[PDB]
Design a protein around this ligand. Structure first.
Ligand SMILES: [K+]
Length: 462
């Protein structure tokens, strides 16, 4: 089966690569410019757009370049006369779709679109705080670590779901409910058994991430409300709190930008023939041989920009910094400590003071995602820091109450020498491709374990 799965995924990767190579030819990019990560973004967003049908399935459109709905594109950056120059290209969505399909042996390769969509999601996860979204949902900002895939477009399911975290689901459910509290037949008619079927589906997706019968059970109690309101809200928030301790099973998917794949395909790599898996050496191998540049703002530290992108590539934001640091071979610091802002350049920034720099995306070691395999690894889910504890164990002194609420607290209060939902990394030498010798990591215990400690990133909604 993996016999043909590695092929199937490989096949996808070829397609993104070929697509990218061709888009580079189209736009007449210099080798450097094609390796410019902000150009990679614009090109990815382009193809995503061309297939979105304005559904917000694959992306959210600004619309900072597209009033004419038949057309799509964004800022492309070229090096001219010792200056970085930004131009907005517009293309026919039809034309893009053409090129995309052509790069995919004539297929629709929806998996490729999704792969790019997740890469963006991962990049946003590494970059932007969601503190504001959480309060407006009545959640606790210390739940920031449950907010995987929080930034995925409002329509997706096929593969979108697996990467969303427990908080993201709670937030999405709460948002629905909250709007059944300004009613207007939100729950009656065609519409309100339409949404009622959505709501059901979501609760199930939620339920699935949960890894104890107590919490799943409690989820069912919420699903099978009927006019959902403040009652369920409370239970959900209760549920999110429990997810800080009895954590959910959430897929972390390591998806690289299109330029990396493009470059590998131009280097004659045959992904379909060789196979591809997101879960082990494959993305590490690619990143070791890659050459990606980035635009850089004055007073930003190239190394920090580098961290930001590495993290995103390896989908590592909600993972223990100490593990990341160990695999990278240089300290992976919390976002608050990072002398950089996001990879994308707001259209009002700038170009006069802009520079480019080389991204450092290598790693000292490589790793297999465990419990996806299960040898000797170490927990790569976040540590129990004070603030996680404090947010996990509150308003139960209060209000609502149940046998489901009492179990759960019970499980929480006693929560193991090891811990439920084991997201791992097994770590190997790059000189040990076949994985013959697990390295037992030695963490530096003085490092902060949470990407989100002292966070100060721009808030995502802006
Ligand atoms: K910062």
């Amino acid at each position: 089966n993996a016999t043909e799965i590695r092929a199937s995924v490989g096949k996808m990767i070829d397609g993104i690569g070929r697509f990218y190579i061709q888009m580079c030819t189209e736009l007449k990019l210099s080798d450097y410019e094609g390796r410019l990560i902000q150009n990679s973004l614009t090109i990815e967003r382009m193809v995503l757009s061309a297939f979105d049908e304005r559904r917000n399935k694959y992306l959210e459109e600004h619309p900072s370049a597209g009033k004419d709905p038949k057309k799509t594109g964004g800022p492309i950056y070229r090096r001219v006369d010792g200056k970085w120059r930004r131009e907005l290209i517009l293309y026919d969505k039809e034309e893009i779709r053409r090129i995309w399909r052509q790069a995919n042996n004539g297929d629709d390769a929806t998996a490729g679109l999704t792969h790019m969509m997740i890469w963006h999601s991962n990049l946003n996860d590494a970059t932007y705080q969601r503190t504001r979204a959480l309060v407006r949902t009545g959640m606790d900002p210390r739940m920031c670590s449950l907010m995987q895939g929080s930034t995925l477009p409002r329509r997706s399911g096929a593969a979108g779901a697996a990467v969303k975290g427990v908080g993201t689901m709670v937030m999405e459910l709460i948002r629905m409910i909250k709007r059944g509290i300004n009613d207007r037949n939100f729950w009656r008619g065609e519409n309100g058994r339409r949404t009622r079927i959505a709501y059901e589906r979501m609760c199930n997706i939620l339920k699935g991430k949960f890894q104890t019968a107590a919490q799943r059970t409690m989820v069912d109690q919420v699903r099978e409300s009927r006019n959902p309101g403040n009652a369920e809200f409370e239970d959900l928030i209760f549920l999110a709190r429990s997810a800080l301790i009895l954590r959910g099973s959430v897929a972390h998917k390591s998806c690289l930008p299109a330029c990396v794949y493009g470059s590998a395909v131009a280097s004659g790599y045959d992904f379909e023939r060789e196979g591809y898996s997101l879960v082990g050496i494959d993305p590490f191998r690619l990143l070791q041989n890659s050459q990606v540049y980035s635009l850089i703002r004055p007073n930003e530290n190239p190394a920090h920009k580098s961290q930001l992108v590495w993290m995103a590539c390896h989908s590592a934001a909600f993972e223990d910094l100490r593990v990341s640091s160990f695999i990278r071979g240089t300290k992976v610091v919390p976002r608050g400590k990072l002398s950089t802002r996001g990879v994308q350049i707001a259209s009002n920034e700038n170009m006069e003071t802009m520079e480019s720099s080389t991204l450092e995306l290598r790693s000292r070691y490589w790793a297999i995602r465990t419990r996806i395999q299960p040898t000797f690894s170490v927990q790569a889910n976040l540590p129990f820091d004070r603030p996680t504890i404090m947010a996990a164990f509150t308003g139960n002194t209060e209000g609502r109450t149940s046998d489901m609420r009492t179990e759960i607290i019970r499980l929480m209060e006693s929560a193991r020498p090891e811990d439920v939902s084991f997201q791992g990394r097994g770590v190997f030498e790059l000189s040990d491709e076949k994985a013959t010798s697990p390295i037992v990591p030695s963490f530096d215990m003085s490092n902060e374990g949470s990407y989100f400690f002292g966070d100060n990133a721009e808030e995502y909604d802006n």
